[model samples]
Target: SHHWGYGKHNGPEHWHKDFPIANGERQSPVDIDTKAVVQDPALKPLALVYGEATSRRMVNNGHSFNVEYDDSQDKAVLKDGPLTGTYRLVQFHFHWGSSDDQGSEHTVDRKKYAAELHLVHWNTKYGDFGTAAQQPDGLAVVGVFLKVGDANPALQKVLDALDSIKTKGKSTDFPNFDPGSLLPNVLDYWTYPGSLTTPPLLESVTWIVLKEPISVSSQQMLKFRTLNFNAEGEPELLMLANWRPAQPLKNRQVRGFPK
Candidate 1:
């Protein structure tokens, strides 16, 4: 049934019981130790050509709400920056905290943000997401940390849509939305080889984590907590602290780009 959720009983610690790959090498959300990172000047600048990109729907899928895109073709895609082929933007989602002090899955020099945003993309070389995910370089995800600051106007539109999909399994048409607006001014990032943070825990992602954080006002932060992990009629449990803790960085080294 894949009945996993972020509870003490079903949290990350217990994931390996159901999915053995959870303990495998190259797992995700590793702490970004800047001193240990190797500067890879060869890594090109990230090129996001959404070019009038839009989302078709957003779903509160119990764990988190994901805004999905039509990846039938490369309408919106991520290219360059430690990648050999283009990756199509499939969906984007967030992991937030019960409160503001913590929530981000990936930490920076042992630091945590109020929340984290992940824009998931699958490599085009493999044809489809399901098939691509089987390979080590099958996916590319851009991670943006959401730090608390002044109101970010771009964030308001996505926050406003949360009201319509408050409970788990609830979804609505969330079109005309451009995800590019949510990125930081500069795209300086840390790149690494890692797995999906969630279950099935495939080690197929080349993570591109932004060094800069987007702003999320405290007032706006409250709106994210309003979402419920429980579907309507289940015991109304607010979805918060929905992030996996940082895992061990085994034999892998993180690469940094200076462009």
Candidate 2:
């Protein structure tokens, strides 16, 4: 297996050596130019119906804290918006920095946020997430930006669970949590064709990045950095700033939808 990580020699800059698609057209985390965004009247309002039971387990994957979901069926899903069909919620994860200066993957007019939330959803037509990863328009990820402000009570349950899985490869039961509360009040977003921000870097996602960002206190963010990229019994390494730099937009047009 090809081992990859966030170290200086193994980071995004070096990913293309292992995954050639990393430098392919329509890569993710592209800078969204609001001034140049075309308002699409046909874009419908995003309809997200997330259930508490969908929150299954939280894992420290040596990269970031990912809260997995039960995507066996459409118990929880995202519809409408810029989607042609329903996409099942598979998992929710975060990419953050050591400090509040920057961490978000996607940027607005080249401005980075404190962090970024990716709710990974797969189109039901593709049968499963693994299958969707190989097809065009098989994935639809909802990207929500995170900013430093008031403490987000919605994230407390998740942040508290982090203590149990602080080390890499650790996982714990994270049940009865509604991930929908993490979304911003406004659903307005920008849409574009792009690949996964992470490797295998499949060009299968239709990115729906929200314009409004949610709040997270500086104190709350401190817990996120405490997560270890190295597992117990191994040299400890803080999992900070696990975000990929913004990729080129190519010939893609980011379409915006009004609230």
Q: Cα deviation in Å at residue 241, candidate 1?
A: 1.4
Cα lDDT tens digits for candidate 2, 10-123: 899999999999999889989998889998889999999986337889999888988999998788899999999989999999999878979999999999888999999999
Q: What is the TM-score of each candidate against the true structure?
A: 0.97, 0.97
Report lDDT (Cα) of residue 169, candidate 2. 89
What TM-score does model 1 achieve against the real structure? 0.97
Q: Which residue pairs clash in candidate 1? A: none
The residue-by-residue lDDT of candidate 1 on 123-199, one tens digit each, is 99999999989899999999999999898899999998999999988999999899998999999999999999998
lDDT for residue 9 in candidate 1, whole number 0-100: 85
For candidate 1, the per-residue lDDT at 202 reads: 98
| Candidate 1, position 207, lDDT | 96
Residue 129, model 2: Cα distance from true site in angstroms:
0.7
Best by lDDT: 1
